[PDB]
């Protein structure tokens, strides 16, 4: 947890710098989008080498997961895995033509990954430097090693609900800059600029999760820095 005054100095992209439909499409992803959330699944099918193809995942009927590389694919190919991420259909290719949804990362190993009790992830939130209280129930997980994507999706859904994050200025979105930090103790902290995604559609806005980054959920909290300028 940094001084809101120091974070304010990083070059965070401003909301006014989003070209086109990216803003409407960021609100769609973090607020309206359906997510793939299932446990105990396995697949050794692929389309390209850096992907794992879940045939008939949907009961879209196929789910194609994309990773940074084959090296990552290999840790999950043929294993029992849990899935939690956002998917899309626009620009998606790889399985039953016309019936494949695509997702970036969101895969964790299923075995021995269940928690003693569900973890409520604490969140520290600052708005223009004033600390705001966030209910403990906001972000929760049952995984011991969880994807940053699973936590970010929960965190941003709340920022949208309570702070109109991805609403236009006219529809009361007052936040112009922001940073989310997953503050881990034992491993490097991940931080994302809330207005820093690239492209305007899901196929590119969601690539930030392609790395399948996973962290230990115990002993960490989330720091959120929001600014109205």
Q: Could you give all domains of the chain from N- to C-terminal order, each with its CATH number?
A: 1-31+113-228 (3.10.20.120), 32-110 (2.40.50.110)
Q: Is 221 annotated as a binding residue?
A: yes
**Rounded distance, CA 136 to CA 122, Å?**
6
**Rounded distance, CA 205 to CA 154, Å?**
17
CA angle 175, 26, 29 (to 5 degrees): 130
Q: Which residues of 16-43 are buried (b: 16+ CB within 10 A; e: fewer)?
A: eebeeebbebbbbbbbebebbeeeebeb
Q: Is 110 annotated as a binding residue?
A: no
Residues 6+ apart with CB under 8 A from 112: 144
Taking a C-beta distance cutoff of 8 angstroms, is the pair 152, 105 a contact?
Answer: no
- The experimental method, as deposited, was X-ray
Q: Is 183 annotated as a binding residue?
A: yes
Closest listed residue to residue 197, CA positions, set 163, 227, 152: 152
Taking a C-beta distance cutoff of 8 angstroms, is the pair 39, 82 a contact?
Answer: yes
Residues 6+ apart with CB under 8 A from 49: 70, 73
Taking a C-beta distance cutoff of 8 angstroms, is the pair 143, 192 a contact?
Answer: no
**Rounded distance, CA 30 to CA 121, Å?**
18
- Cβ burial of 137 (10 Å; 0-12, 13-18, 19+) is exposed
DSSP for the chain reads ---HHHHTTS-PPPGGG--TTHHHHHHIIIII--EEEEEEE---B-SSTTEEEETT-----EEEEE-S-HHHHHHHTTS-EEEEEEEE-TT--SSSTT-EEEEE--EEE-TT-EEEEEEEE-EEEEETTEEE---GGGEEEEESEEEHHHHHHHHHHHHHHHH-TTS-GGGT----EEEEEEE-SSSPPEEEETT---SSSHHHHGGGGTT--EEE-TT-EEEEEEE--
DSSP for 80-96 reads -EEEEEEEE-TT--SSS
CB atoms within 10 A of CB 91: 11
How, if at all, do strands 123-127 and 221-227 pair?
parallel
Taking a C-beta distance cutoff of 8 angstroms, is the pair 106, 87 a contact?
Answer: no
CB atoms within 10 A of CB 191: 15
């Amino acid at each position: 947890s940094e001084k809101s005054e120091e974070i304010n100095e990083k070059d965070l992209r401003k909301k006014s710098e989003l070209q086109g439909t990216a803003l409407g499409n960021l609100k769609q992803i973090y607020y309206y989008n359906e997510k793939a959330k299932t446990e105990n699944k396995e697949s050794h099918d692929q389309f390209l080498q850096h992907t794992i193809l879940f045939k008939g995942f949907f009961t879209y009927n196929d789910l194609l997961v994309d990773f940074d590389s084959k090296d990552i694919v290999d840790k999950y190919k043929g294993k029992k895995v849990d899935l939690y991420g956002a998917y899309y259909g626009y620009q998606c290719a790889g399985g039953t033509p016309n019936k494949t949804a695509c997702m970036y990362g969101g895969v964790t190993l299923h075995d021995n990954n269940r928690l003693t009790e569900e973890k409520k992830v604490p969140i520290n939130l600052w708005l223009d430097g004033k600390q705001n209280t966030v209910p403990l129930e906001t972000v929760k997980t049952n995984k011991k090693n969880v994807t940053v994507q699973e936590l970010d999706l929960q965190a941003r859904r709340y920022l949208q609900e309570k702070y109109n994050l991805y609403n236009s200025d006219v529809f009361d979105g007052k936040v112009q800059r922001g940073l989310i930090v997953f503050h881990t103790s034992t491993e490097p902290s991940v931080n994302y600029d809330l207005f820093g995604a690239q492209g305007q559609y899901s196929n590119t806005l969601l690539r930030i999760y392609r790395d399948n980054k996973t962290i230990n959920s115990e002993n960490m909290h989330i720091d959120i820095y929001l600014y109205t300028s």
